[PDB]
Amino acid sequence: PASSGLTDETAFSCCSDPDPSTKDFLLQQTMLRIKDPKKSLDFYTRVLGLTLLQKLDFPAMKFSLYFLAYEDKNDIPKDKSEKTAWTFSRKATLELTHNWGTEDDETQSYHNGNSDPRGFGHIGIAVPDVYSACKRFEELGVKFVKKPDDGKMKGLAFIQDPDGYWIEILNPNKIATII
Amino acid sequence: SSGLTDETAFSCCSDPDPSTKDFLLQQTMLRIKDPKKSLDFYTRVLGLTLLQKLDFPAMKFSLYFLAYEDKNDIPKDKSEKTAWTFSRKATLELTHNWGTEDDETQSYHNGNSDPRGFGHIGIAVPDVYSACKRFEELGVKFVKKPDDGKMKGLAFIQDPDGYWIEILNPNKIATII
Numbered sequence: 033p034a035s036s037g038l039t040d041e042t043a044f045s046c047c048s049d050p051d052p053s054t055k056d057f058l059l060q061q062t063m064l065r066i067k068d069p070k071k072s073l074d075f076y077t078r079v080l081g082l083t084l085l086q087k088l089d090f091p092a093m094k095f096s097l098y099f100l101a102y103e104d105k106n107d108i109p110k111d112k113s114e115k116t117a118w119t120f121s122r123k124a125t126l127e128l129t130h131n132w133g134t135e136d137d138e139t140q141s142y143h144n145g146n147s148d149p150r151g152f153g154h155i156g157i158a159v160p161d162v163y164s165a166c167k168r169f170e171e172l173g174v175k176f177v178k179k180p181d182d183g184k185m186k187g188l189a190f191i192q193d194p195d196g197y198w199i200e201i202l203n204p205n206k207i208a209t210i211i
Numbered sequence: 212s213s214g215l216t217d218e219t220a221f222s223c224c225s226d227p228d229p230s231t232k233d234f235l236l237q238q239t240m241l242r243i244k245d246p247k248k249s250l251d252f253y254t255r256v257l258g259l260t261l262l263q264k265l266d267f268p269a270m271k272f273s274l275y276f277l278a279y280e281d282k283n284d285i286p287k288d289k290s291e292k293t294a295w296t297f298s299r300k301a302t303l304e305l306t307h308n309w310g311t312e313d314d315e316t317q318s319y320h321n322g323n324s325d326p327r328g329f330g331h332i333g334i335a336v337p338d339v340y341s342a343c344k345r346f347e348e349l350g351v352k353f354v355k356k357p358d359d360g361k362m363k364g365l366a367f368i369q370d371p372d373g374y375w376i377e378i379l380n381p382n383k384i385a386t387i388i
């Protein structure tokens with residue numbers, strides 16, 4: 033029997049109610065390696081409107097971590113120790129990992145997971161209006177993987193960040209209409 | 212090299228444009244070889260809830276959406292359920308291309324060897340050691356046990372596809388550095 037995927041029945045049959053030990057777990061971060069934080073920080077804050085919660089430097093291992101999320105900057109504790117506990121307890125953050133030097137190495141680039149070898153596909157952002165968001169993205173020179181009305185999924189877009197990671201742009205209140 | 216000073220890094224950040232007002236980081240998507248194994252892992256092992264499943268037979272794949280949400284908060288009718296799912300923060304979209312689970316020569320790439328890119332998702336938990344003790348008991352595979360290395364109290368496990376999952380305690384991170 034050629035795979036026709038799971039029925040809803042099988043799928044949900046594979047699903048267990050959370051064990052009480054897992055009751056306070058949260059999905060805290062998605063980590064992506066970045067070649068050049070100057071570009072990545074600009075894109076994510078200025079184009080997408082995230083806020084840089086914290087920059088952590090690790091001299092012993094020659095990398096930095098940049099945590100970005102949709103949070104009000106006024107909410108960030110100034111104190112380093114308090115900043116840390118707050119940042120790592122936010123939901124839905126991006127951890128951008130910068131291995132020092134990569135920005136100056138012409139031979140280096142990271143792989144976005146969407147060609148051989150595939151794996152990771154993208155992160156995704158819900159917006160109140162995909163068409164207006166993308167017109168703005170266009171005016172800002174953002175590279176598109178899929179414009180909102182190209183292809184057969186109309187009203188859905190994919191853009192790329194400076195490393196070429198894909199970012200889905202969607203309106204959650206209009207997805208059902210395109211299945 | 213040396214990496215960015217705070218001045219350089221901070222100067223590259225703009226305040227949010229008002230038009231990005233209620234933008235939210237909604238999903239991270241991973242391709243998965245076997246949804247039976249994945250769904251068991253994320254729900255039973257990790258404690259996420261499957262919010263919704265979408266099939267696209269035309270293109271031979273399913274999308275599964277999981278989050279740390281109460282399933283009693285999931286709308287029954289399809290339209291309303293879709294709109295809610297896609298408006299939850301911090302979801303996981305697992306993409307199953309029909310066939311792969313029967314193909315012995317097939318595996319996805321977790322981004323942690325050449326060519327590198329994506330690294331991991333990370334779970335904030337109350338107690339990394341009790342969490343990993345349970346994972347161990349349950350047969351979960353580890354990359355970094357909580358107590359190995361210079362950064363003790365922080366772990367990395369693998370999902371059924373080999374993607375790394377960080378296990379951290381927010382109240383012990385600053386200490387760990």
Ligand SMILES: COc1ccc2c(c1)c(CC(=O)O)c(C)n2C(=O)c1ccc(Cl)cc1
Nearest residue numbers: 090091092093355359360361362363365384
């Ligand atoms: C400076 O030396 C380091 C720094 C980070 C490290 C490690 C060693 C090791 C290896 C080791 O612990 O020896 C692991 C696994 N690290 C991490 O991935 C990590 C990521 C984010 C945070 Cl905030 C903390 C740790």
Ligand SMILES: [Zn+2]
Nearest residue numbers: 063127333377
């Ligand atoms: Zn991490």
Ligand SMILES: [Zn+2]
Nearest residue numbers: 156200240304
């Ligand atoms: Zn997606």
